């Protein structure tokens, strides 16, 4: 809405209570959507002259799409929004606006990969509450999305070429934060619960557990098939369904929501030991949904109106 000209404000996404409030109160919502089309078909008939066409309405499948959720500041307050298109979440924003509500958020429970999120408007951006603390999750934000196709038949598809170009970019931004001369290495999770070891994410009431080892296993800056297919198990998980008071909200069924999506970011963790091999190791992170929320809420903070 209003652009506060000549104002310099200090943000701190790591001490942002919006993140805690959303994580606590926000539940996914779906609504029936229609994507109608028309088919045009020449009515050739005998024997080669088609001076007629048939116009038909088609694509009558109804699926459920996620409804965007907006956080709105209470009466007597407002939301400051950083417009610097490469803000690292901490420090001075030399270009600030005042909005009544956040951008629309389509919540998705996942580990390792952030889906259906917001893209970096300029370059690939990596963030962390503390890059020195190898126990803080590193949040990656891509500037172009990598498509991932997922079927109830238990597998997901990612173009290898697209993924390799994404890894090169991410690994170029990590070399820029940990040493402009260091080998960047991606490896699989080191163990733990299913939700953590696999690319775990929801699709309605169902959760996909995807073997992600094909995605995180390569070495960079150290001088196959065209499609990556990830094997997936799919479980229902009723204890994750939105429960508000007495009522429980049962999401649309399996054939109702499309399980494919756009990867807009990653969650990673960097290894320790400080082995000055001049080469850092990175693995798929997640499990802490607050990290997910921070990846969308980094440019907001609530303040009193005066």
């Amino acid at each position: 809405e209003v652009v506060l000209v000549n104002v310099t404000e200090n943000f701190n996404w790591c001490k942002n209570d919006m993140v805690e409030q959303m994580h606590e109160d926000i539940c996914s919502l779906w609504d029936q959507s229609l994507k109608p089309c028309v088919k045009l078909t020449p009515l050739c008939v005998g024997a080669g002259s088609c001076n007629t066409s048939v116009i038909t309405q088609a694509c009558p499948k109804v699926s459920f799409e996620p409804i965007p959720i907006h956080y709105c500041a209470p009466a007597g307050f407002a939301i400051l929004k950083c417009n610097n298109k490469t803000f690292n979440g901490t420090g001075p924003c030399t270009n600030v606006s005042t909005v009544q509500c956040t951008h629309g958020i389509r919540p998705v429970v996942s580990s390792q990969l952030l889906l259906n999120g917001s893209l970096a408007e300029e370059e690939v951006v990596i963030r962390s509450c503390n890059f020195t603390d190898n126990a803080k999750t590193i949040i990656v934000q891509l500037n172009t999305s990598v498509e991932i196709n997922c079927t109830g038949a238990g597998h997901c598809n990612i173009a290898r070429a697209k993924w390799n170009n994404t890894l090169k970019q991410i690994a170029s931004k990590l070399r820029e934060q940990f040493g402009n001369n260091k080998t960047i290495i991606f490896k699989q999770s080191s163990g733990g619960d299913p939700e953590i070891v696999t690319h775990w994410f929801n699709c309605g009431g169902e959760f996909f557990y995807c073997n992600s080892t094909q995605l995180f296993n390569s070495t960079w800056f150290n001088s196959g098939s065209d499609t990556i297919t990830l094997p997936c198990r799919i479980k229902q998980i009723i204890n994750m369904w939105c429960k508000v008071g007495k009522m429980m909200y049962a999401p649309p069924i399996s054939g109702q929501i499309r399980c494919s999506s756009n990867i807009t970011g990653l969650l990673l963790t960097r290894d320790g030991g400080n082995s000055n091999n001049e080469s850092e190791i990175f693995r798929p992170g997640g499990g802490d949904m607050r990290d997910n929320w921070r990846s969308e809420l980094y440019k907001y903070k609530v303040v009193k109106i005066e």
Partner: antibody, heavy 128, light 109 residues
Framework: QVQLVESGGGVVQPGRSLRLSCAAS????????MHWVRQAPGKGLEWVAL????????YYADSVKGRFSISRDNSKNTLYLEMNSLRAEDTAVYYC?????????????????????WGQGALVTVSS | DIQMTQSPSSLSASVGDRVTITCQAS??????LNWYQQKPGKAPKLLIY???NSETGVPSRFSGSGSGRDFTFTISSLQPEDVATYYC??????????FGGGTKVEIKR
């Protein structure tokens, strides 16, 4: 080096309560589910409780159901077990144990994959 | 609620012998079954997870086979240090159950 260390064992009289803890190190605690298993004098290993990585889903054995409580503190890397209304039967060594991850040899999503590392244990003696 | 049976309850064998413990489940548990070893006083160590997979650092002489309701644990060449009580344990679903007391293995010398 995966290490688990139980603390807070000793005597406690019938009816009263007691809370054991387990200090974890050598691995990323907040990624692994955790188990409590107990073994009475000269008897067998009896599974007591399980808590998942995010400390949300908890599972109990019928015997201690309603009297025992399991929880974790991923910030301090410790696992807790609080026991109430203790009886003579509850006298035993209590082991904390780390559930195996999802290893590449598995091919299904289960509630547990069984322990791999165990602590040395802490003896709890219910007596007056 | 699944019940586990092991056999024998206890046995004596000589150094170098092949020892073969069997486990049985009251119902189908695919291969979701672990074997543990507990020496007197100490805490159990894992030796085999999911029926046939050998845990890291575990001597080559320890193996496991089976699936469904019937399983086998095997020490190919019994050593003096292998004296212990062995427990089998299912994880098809909680409560995780075993055989009360397991199987005690002793040396005859």
């Amino acid at each position: 080096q995966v290490q688990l260390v139980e603390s807070g064992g000793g005597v406690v009289q019938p009816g009263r309560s007691l809370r054991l803890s387990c200090a974890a190190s050598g691995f990323t605690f907040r990624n692994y589910a955790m188990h409590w298993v107990r073994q009475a004098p000269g008897k067998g290993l009896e599974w007591v409780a399980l808590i998942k990585y995010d400390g949300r889903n908890k599972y109990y054995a019928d015997s201690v159901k309603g009297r025992f409580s399991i929880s974790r503190d991923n910030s301090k890397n410790t696992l807790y077990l609080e026991m109430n209304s203790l009886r003579a039967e509850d006298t035993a060594v209590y082991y904390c144990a780390r559930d195996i991850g999802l290893k590449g040899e598995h091919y299904d999503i289960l509630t547990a994959y069984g322990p791999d590392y165990w602590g040395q244990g802490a003896l709890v003696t219910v007596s007056s | 609620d699944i019940q586990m049976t092991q056999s024998p309850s206890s046995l004596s064998a000589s150094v170098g012998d092949r020892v073969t413990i069997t486990c049985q489940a009251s119902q189908d548990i695919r291969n979701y079954l672990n074997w543990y070893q507990q020496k007197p006083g100490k805490a159990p160590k894992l030796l085999i997870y999911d029926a046939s997979n050998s845990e890291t650092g575990v001597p080559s002489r320890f193996s496991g086979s089976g699936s469904g309701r019937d399983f086998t644990f095997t020490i190919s060449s019994l050593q003096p240090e292998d004296v212990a009580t062995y427990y089998c344990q299912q994880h098809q679903n909680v409560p995780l159950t075993t055989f009360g007391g397991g199987t005690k293995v002793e040396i005859k010398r």
